[PDB]
Amino acid sequence: QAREEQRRQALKSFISRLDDLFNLPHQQWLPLHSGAPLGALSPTNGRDDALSAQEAFLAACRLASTRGDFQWCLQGLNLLVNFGRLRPDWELSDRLMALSLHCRRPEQAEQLLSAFPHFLACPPSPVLLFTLIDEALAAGRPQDVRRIFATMREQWQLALRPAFYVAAIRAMLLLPTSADQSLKEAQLVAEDAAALGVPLPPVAHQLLVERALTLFEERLRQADLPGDCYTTEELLNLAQESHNRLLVDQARDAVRRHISVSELFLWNRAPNAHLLAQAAWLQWAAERFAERHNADWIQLLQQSCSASLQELAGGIDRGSSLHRGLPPALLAALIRSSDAS
Amino acid sequence: AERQPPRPTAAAMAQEILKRVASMKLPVEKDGKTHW
Amino acid sequence: EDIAAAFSSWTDLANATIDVLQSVEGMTNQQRRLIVKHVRLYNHGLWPEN
Amino acid sequence: VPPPLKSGIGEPKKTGYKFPHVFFPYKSRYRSPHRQRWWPGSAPRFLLHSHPKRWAPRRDLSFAFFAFHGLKPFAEKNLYELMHSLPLRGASSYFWREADSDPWKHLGRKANRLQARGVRTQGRKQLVFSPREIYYKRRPFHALVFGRLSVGQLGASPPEAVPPEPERAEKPPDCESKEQRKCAGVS
RNA sequence: AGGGAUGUUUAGCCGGGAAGUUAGCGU
RNA sequence: GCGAGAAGGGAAGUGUGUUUCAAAG
RNA sequence: UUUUUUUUUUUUUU
What letter represents residue A130's amino acid?
A: F
Distance of alpha carbon A82 from alpha carbon D10, whole angstroms: 6
Residue pairs spanning C and D at CB distance below 8 A? 15
Burial class for A171, CB neighbours closer than 10 Å (0-12, 13-18, 19+): buried
Q: Give the list of residues 6+ apart from residue A49 with CB closer than 8 angstroms, or none.
A: A34, A35
What is the strand order of the sheet D125-133 is part of?
A: D125-133, D146-153, D174-175
Q: Which nucleotide is nearest to D179 (CA to C1')?
A: G6
Please note each residue after which chain D is broken, C-to-N distance over 2.5 A, or write none. 122
Distance of alpha carbon D129 from alpha carbon D78, whole angstroms: 14
**DSSP letter, residue D52:** B
**DSSP letter, residue D148:** E
Considering only CA atoms, name the residue closest to the C1' of nucleotide F5: D27
What letter represents residue D3's amino acid?
A: P
Give the resolution in Å. 3.3
C-alpha A283 chain-centroid distance: 34
Distance of alpha carbon A108 from alpha carbon D63, whole angstroms: 8
Identify from B23, B28, B30, B31 which residue to disrupt to test chain D contact, counting D C-beta atoms within 10 A and taking the largest count: B23
Q: Give the list of residues 6+ apart from residue A42 with CB closer than 8 angstroms, or none.
A: none
DSSP β-bridge partners for residue D95 = D129
C-beta atoms surrounding D28 within 10 Å: 8
Q: Is D152 helix (H, G, I), strand (E, B) or coil?
A: strand
DSSP β-bridge partners for residue D148 = D130
Element (DSSP H or E) covering residue D146? strand D146-153
Q: Which chains border D (3 or more CB–CB pairs < 8 Å)?
A: A, B, C
Q: Phi, psi at residue D149, to the nearest 5°?
A: -95, 125
Estimate in Å the CA A37 to C1' G2 gap, whole number: 16
- Select the residue of C30, C34, C50 nearest D117 (Cβ to Cβ): C50
Q: Which chains border B (3 or more CB–CB pairs < 8 Å)?
A: D
Distance of alpha carbon A136 from alpha carbon A172, whole angstroms: 12
C-beta atoms surrounding A72 within 10 Å: 20
Q: Which nucleotides of chain G does any protein CB come within 7 A of?
A: 2-6, 9-12
Q: Give the list of residues 6+ apart from residue A141 with CB closer than 8 angstroms, or none.
A: none
Cis amide prior to B8 (ω within 30 degrees): no
Cis amide prior to D73 (ω within 30 degrees): no
Contact between A176 and A139 (Cβ < 8 Å): no
The set of residues with CB closer than 7 Å to nucleic strand F is: D 29-31, 33
Contact between D168 and D151 (Cβ < 8 Å): yes
Helices (H), A28-162: 53-60, 68-83, 90-102, 106-113, 126-139, 145-154
Considering only CA atoms, which of A210, A241, A306, A318 is closest in space to residue A272? A318
Considering only CA atoms, which of A283, A277, A287, A252 is closest in space to residue A329? A277
What letter represents residue D114's amino acid?
A: L
Residue A12 touches chain D, beta carbons under 8 Å: no
Contact between D44 and D37 (Cβ < 8 Å): yes
